[PDB]
Amino acid sequence: KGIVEKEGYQLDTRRQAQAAYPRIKVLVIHYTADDFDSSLATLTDKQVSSHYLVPAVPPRYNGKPRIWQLVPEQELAWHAGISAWRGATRLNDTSIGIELENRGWQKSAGVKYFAPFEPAQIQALIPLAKDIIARYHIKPENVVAHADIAPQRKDDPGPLFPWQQLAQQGIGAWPDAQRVNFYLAGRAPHTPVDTASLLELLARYGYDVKPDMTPREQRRVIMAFQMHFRPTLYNGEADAETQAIAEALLEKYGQD
Ligand SMILES: [Cl-]
Ligand SMILES: [Zn+2]
Ligand SMILES: [Zn+2]
């Protein structure tokens, strides 16, 4: 018995389709580049928003870190902008955005330095990320960086964001070391490798790769990937190790 009275008609809900699935498929990670109070004001203006805001060191109550929610999950937030991941565009529509309070980068004697993420912030992020993934059956290759989906425009969350520590906790994609090793084929890690080959691999993993991009545009794409997946060097140049890693990721998780 599922008969709902509506105005002008009634609804029989006793028969339920098997082909029914979530509208949320992707979880997206950001940094605020600002203090908490500025961030908060900004994420609640009329230009941008997000679903969660995590302070740099969450305050505790009941013995529990407090995280702020600004948009209810069932609705979209304006966080991703112009974006593209694994064949999808308009990523606001199909994603949840978490904002973390972090400084980002600044030039410090002309040298583009990034700011590290507090243990206490990650500790709070874990439980939340886990709940969201479980709720919507999000797949690990779809836990991403803002930069992963907007490679020409965004850097966040940057190379100091601990993707690997999180993978150990069933949070987001990460290759098997053995298989990376295999795919290196005993080349030295920094051995130059065909640029176009690497882009083809990157496009198929999910990166927005257009035909006829400028050498600068090609570097941004490779650079984005390196910040997530090989943070020791992210100069956007193509090399044996970078390719090995993409090769290993497409093996473990595929093209969707
Ligand atoms: Cl209170
Ligand atoms: Zn962002
Ligand atoms: Zn309050």
UniProtKB/Swiss-Prot annotation:
Its EC number is 3.5.1.28. The keyword Nucleus does not apply. GO terms for cellular component: cell outer membrane; outer membrane. It is an enzyme of class 3 (hydrolase). Zn(2+) binds at residues 30, 146, 156. CDD domains: PGRP (cd06583). It is a lipid-anchor. The record marks 154 as: Transition state stabilizer. It is found in: Cell outer membrane. One of its GO terms (biological process) is peptidoglycan turnover. SMART domains: Ami_2 (SM00644). It catalyses: Hydrolyzes the link between N-acetylmuramoyl residues and L-amino acid residues in certain cell-wall glycopeptides. Keywords: Cell outer membrane, Cell wall biogenesis/degradation, Hydrolase, Lipoprotein, Membrane, Metal-binding, Palmitate, Signal, Zinc. Substrate binds at residues 31-32. InterPro entries: Amidase/PGRP_sf, Amidase_domain, NAMLAA_amidase_2, PGBD-like_sf, PGBDSf. Its cofactor is Zn(2+). Binds 1 zinc ion per subunit. Disulfide bonds: none annotated. The active site is at 99 (proton acceptor). Belongs to the N-acetylmuramoyl-L-alanine amidase 2 family. This is N-acetylmuramoyl-L-alanine amidase AmiD.
